[PDB]
Each structure stands twice: as structure tokens, then as C-alpha cells.
Enzyme design. Sequence first.
Site, PDB file in Angstrom:
ATOM      1  N   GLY A 118      -0.564  11.120   8.117  1.00 39.59           N
ATOM      2  CA  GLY A 118       0.255  12.148   8.746  1.00 39.59           C
ATOM      3  C   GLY A 118       1.106  12.931   7.757  1.00 39.59           C
ATOM      4  O   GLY A 118       1.374  12.471   6.646  1.00 39.59           O
ATOM      5  N   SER A 170       3.753  13.956   2.573  1.00 36.61           N
ATOM      6  CA  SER A 170       2.657  13.390   3.349  1.00 36.61           C
ATOM      7  C   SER A 170       2.608  11.896   3.037  1.00 36.61           C
ATOM      8  O   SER A 170       3.073  11.446   1.983  1.00 36.61           O
ATOM      9  CB  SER A 170       1.329  14.057   2.990  1.00 36.61           C
ATOM     10  OG  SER A 170       0.959  13.769   1.657  1.00 36.61           O
ATOM     11  N   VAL A 171       2.049  11.133   3.964  1.00 36.53           N
ATOM     12  CA  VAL A 171       1.973   9.693   3.816  1.00 36.53           C
ATOM     13  C   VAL A 171       0.543   9.166   3.809  1.00 36.53           C
ATOM     14  O   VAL A 171      -0.323   9.669   4.524  1.00 36.53           O
ATOM     15  CB  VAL A 171       2.750   9.004   4.959  1.00 36.53           C
ATOM     16  CG1 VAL A 171       2.765   7.505   4.757  1.00 36.53           C
ATOM     17  CG2 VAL A 171       4.165   9.550   5.023  1.00 36.53           C
ATOM     18  N   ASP A 223      13.446   7.150   9.268  1.00 38.44           N
ATOM     19  CA  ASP A 223      13.640   8.560   9.527  1.00 38.44           C
ATOM     20  C   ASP A 223      12.601   9.454   8.858  1.00 38.44           C
ATOM     21  O   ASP A 223      12.692   9.731   7.660  1.00 38.44           O
ATOM     22  CB  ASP A 223      15.032   8.983   9.058  1.00 38.44           C
ATOM     23  CG  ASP A 223      15.411  10.368   9.541  1.00 38.44           C
ATOM     24  OD1 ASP A 223      14.506  11.080  10.004  1.00 38.44           O
ATOM     25  OD2 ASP A 223      16.602  10.744   9.458  1.00 38.44           O
TER      26      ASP A 223
HETATM   27  C1  LIG Z   1      16.535   9.689   5.652  1.00 38.37           C
HETATM   28  N1  LIG Z   1      16.530   8.259   5.990  1.00 38.37           N
HETATM   29  N2  LIG Z   1      17.560   7.582   6.650  1.00 38.37           N
HETATM   30  C2  LIG Z   1      17.145   6.322   6.774  1.00 38.37           C
HETATM   31  C3  LIG Z   1      17.864   5.329   7.407  1.00 38.37           C
HETATM   32  C4  LIG Z   1      19.169   5.924   7.994  1.00 38.37           C
HETATM   33  C5  LIG Z   1      17.040   4.718   8.560  1.00 38.37           C
HETATM   34  C6  LIG Z   1      18.251   4.223   6.407  1.00 38.37           C
HETATM   35  C7  LIG Z   1      15.893   6.185   6.205  1.00 38.37           C
HETATM   36  C8  LIG Z   1      15.549   7.413   5.728  1.00 38.37           C
HETATM   37  N3  LIG Z   1      14.449   7.739   5.050  1.00 38.37           N
HETATM   38  C9  LIG Z   1      13.217   7.303   5.329  1.00 38.37           C
HETATM   39  O1  LIG Z   1      12.983   6.567   6.306  1.00 38.37           O
HETATM   40  N4  LIG Z   1      12.220   7.704   4.543  1.00 38.37           N
HETATM   41  C10 LIG Z   1      10.945   7.341   4.670  1.00 38.37           C
HETATM   42  C11 LIG Z   1      10.258   7.071   3.536  1.00 38.37           C
HETATM   43  C12 LIG Z   1       8.927   6.715   3.595  1.00 38.37           C
HETATM   44  C13 LIG Z   1       8.314   6.636   4.772  1.00 38.37           C
HETATM   45 CL1  LIG Z   1       6.628   6.205   4.802  1.00 38.37          CL
HETATM   46  C14 LIG Z   1       8.983   6.901   5.925  1.00 38.37           C
HETATM   47  C15 LIG Z   1      10.331   7.260   5.872  1.00 38.37           C
END
Ligand SMILES: Cn1nc(C(C)(C)C)cc1NC(=O)Nc1ccc(Cl)cc1
EC number: 2.7.11.24
Length: 331
Positions: free
Chosen positions: A27, A33-34, A160
Site C-alpha cells: 500500500g 510506500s510500504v 499512524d
Molecule cells: C506519526 N506516528 N505517531 C505514532 C504514534 C503516536 C502511534 C507513536 C506512530 C507514528 N508513526 C508511524 O506509525 N509510522 C509508521 C511507520 C511505518 C509503518 Cl509500516 C507504519 C507507520
Amino acid sequence: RPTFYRQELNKTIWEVPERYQNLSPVGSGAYGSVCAAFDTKTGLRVAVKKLSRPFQSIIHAKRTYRELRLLKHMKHENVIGLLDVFTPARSLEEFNDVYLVTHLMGADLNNIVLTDDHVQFLIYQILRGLKYIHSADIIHRDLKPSNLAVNEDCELKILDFGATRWYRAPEIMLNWMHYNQTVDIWSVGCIMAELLTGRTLFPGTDHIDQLKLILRLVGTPGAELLKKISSESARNYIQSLTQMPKMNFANVFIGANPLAVDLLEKMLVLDSDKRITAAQALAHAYFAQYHDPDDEPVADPYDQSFESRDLLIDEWKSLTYDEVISFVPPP
Ligand SMILES: Cn1nc(C(C)(C)C)cc1NC(=O)Nc1ccc(Cl)cc1
């Protein structure tokens, strides 16, 4: 330094360490992208995200530095955590790409389509994770089904990626800018209602419609609440609506666990000052089957003083490069 290897997965090109095998696009986002992958060093199925335009501007750079600081700090079972972070560049001079690695969860809290049992397990984990991140002065502010990773074991981790208004607390709708952490509790409330019910609780069409639908349930703000609204604009809007009475949650959520309806009452309170907190919710009788105050840890102190800084792209980049190099993987 590991030996990287290149390849192209559609429009996006990837250059990652051999350690990660069989990359599969899962996705895209406006921030990267992941790719689902196999980490041979651990046998684990992992997810690898390549930041789109790491340092396209001041904002992208700052965001990138933020993305890294947060994930490097998160260490909780119900919160996403960093397994590894790497770059193809051997120096800051050639440093233009960032790759984050984490546990592959599979489906989002949306997909999963719920017995009162899963509901109390699911929401319990969100609150457990929210207690933790909240203890670090971090407000998610964008909680919703798609930002909730659940595996086949019903284990959940908050994260997130990047609708939304359907879950935003009213005081962030009206465009207020002095909101506390409980904005997240309101989202939880909206998510929990969606599970027991099967319907999005507040399917608004805009910042106005959304606010109306909300009041239609919780009711118009009384004297105490209107009394705390600074914005004459917002104040005049709310007061200009046909007075709306609070509904009986026992009715709105027909035949649901009574203890579940009570928690919904405590989560969907219009005045952020009286809304239950993550810590207090973990103790609600609804989670008696899972609550354990000895296993609901708080986070180490988190330094977010950079959030008020204004730097140049190279500085935000340099700080980010340091971060990648100083990374220490988990056990
Ligand atoms: C921006 N943000 N804020 C948080 C929290 C508040 C949940 C720690 C986490 C994040 N960032 C992410 O969750 N980043 C992220 C990195 C890689 C994948 Cl595959 C999916 C998501």
C-alpha cells in the site's frame, strides 16, 4: 555496513539490505510506500517503509525527523515499534533516503468484521497503548480504524499511517487549539461504538454536519461548557442550534453489555475536562477481565522540544542522520 541490493516495485524503486527478502508492495501513502518482507536474520515477517520525499522541504524534513524520534522511542506491546532503520547512503552528503522497518501485523482494525469479548480485548489494548504514549505527553489526535493494527491473534498495536473527522473530538472540529490528550479517548469511544454496533457512530459530511451529528447524541453544551468556549464564532454557532437533549446511551446502543454502555458515556462527554482518561478507563469494570495495574507501564521521558524549533532542511536532515546511525535494535 550490510550489503544492500536494488530492485523496482512499480513507480517506486527500493534499495535495501540483503537481510530483507521477497519485498511485496502492501500500500501507499503521501509520506511513503510500504513493502511486506521476510527478515532472514529473525525469521520474522516484517514491514518496510520507504519515506517518499524525506527532505523535500522544511516540513517534510521535520516530519521525517519526527517520524524517526517517535518510533525510536515507542517500546510497548500495543504500540508500533522500530525493528530497524537504514539508509543506502554511506555519508550525510549522499543521504537522501530513509527506510523504517517494523513488525508485519496484517489487517487494520477496519478489516476485522464483534463479540463483546473481542470488543473488550480490542479496546483494552488501545487504552493500554494510549496510557503509555499519553504518559510521554504525546497526543495521537488522528485515531481511527485504519491506524489500528490487529493480527490473527487479536493483538493490537496503535500506529499512524497517513475518513478522519468521523472520529475527531468536537473541540478539534470547532478548530479549537488548546485541547488535551482526551481527544484520543473520544476517538476510542467512536471506535468502540463502531465495533459493538457495526456502524460508524458519526458519519459526518464536513466539519459542520459532523458537529451536528455529535450533538444529536451527546446534546447541546450547557452553561458550564459554553462558558469555556473562547471563540465567539464557535460559541455563536453552537448556541444558534435548536437545543438538543442528551440521549440515553442504554437506548442508542440497544442490547450491549451494560458495562460497555457506561464506558461509552464516560468517553463521549463533550467537555474534554470531564472525559475519562486512558489510565482511568483501564480501571473501568468493563475491563475487569483484563485489567492488571502491574502490567500497564508508562513511557520513559520523551524530549519533544524540537517541536518548537524552526530549522533549515540540512539541520533537520543532519539530526535525522545522527538518529539513523545511533539506532540500537531491540532484543
Ligand atoms: C506519526 N506516528 N505517531 C505514532 C504514534 C503516536 C502511534 C507513536 C506512530 C507514528 N508513526 C508511524 O506509525 N509510522 C509508521 C511507520 C511505518 C509503518 Cl509500516 C507504519 C507507520
